[PDB]
């Protein structure tokens, strides 16, 4: 399937144990996609002071369209030293590995895979 319905655990930035997916734009997009498939991917909602507490490169989910079955259609955009790899809509948040942190909420997304 080109799209996959996911429910992403929303994590508080200060709870996150593994603060990024790796060391290159290509690695973090690779790792993010694998964690999304394996159900081991969390979402941090971006506000003032969040991104400096996470590791670059960042992986964002961004709205790709204006929402089947409650699931917002999203795609992945990476960012390193202020350059983004991809073009998409509004940021829903930054992706991180999920290693058992307790979420505050779930974000239903339809991931372009």
**Structural domains for the chain:** 3-112 (2.30.30)
CA separation, residue 21 to residues 13, 69, 105 (Å) = 15, 29, 21
For 79-95, b/e burial (b = at least 16 CB within 10 A) is: beeeeeeeebbebbbbb
Contacts with 94 (C-beta within 8 Å, 6 or more apart), sequence order: 43, 44, 46, 50, 51, 54, 58, 59, 60
> Are the beta carbons of 44 and 103 closer than 8 angstroms?
no
Q: Are 86 and 77 in contact (CB under 8 A)?
A: yes
Give backbone dihedrals phi and psi of 108, rounded to 5 degrees, phi first.
-75, 120
Query: Resolution to 1 decimal, in Å?
Result: 1.8
Experimental method: X-ray
User: Residue 97 in contact with residue 33, Cβ under 8 Å?
Assistant: no
* Cβ-contact 29, 59 below 8 angstroms: yes
Sign of CA dihedral 33, 65, 13, 4: negative
Which residue's entry shows tokens 């058992």?
Answer: 100
Rounded Cα gap, residues 94 and 76, in angstroms? 10
The contacts of residue 82 (CB under 8 Å, 6+ apart) are none
């Amino acid at each position: 399937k080109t799209h996959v319905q996911l429910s992403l655990p929303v994590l508080q930035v200060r709870d996150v144990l593994v603060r990024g997916f790796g060391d290159s734009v290509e690695e973090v997009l690779s790792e993010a996609r694998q964690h999304l498939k394996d159900g081991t991917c969390g979402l941090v909602e971006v506000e003032k002071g969040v991104l400096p507490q996470l590791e670059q490169p960042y992986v964002f989910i961004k709205r790709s369209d204006a929402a089947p079955h409650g699931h917002v259609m999203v795609e992945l955009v990476a960012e390193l030293e202020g350059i983004q790899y991809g073009r998409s809509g509004e940021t829903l948040g930054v992706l991180v590995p999920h290693v058992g942190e307790i979420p505050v909420a779930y974000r239903k997304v339809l991931l372009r895979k």
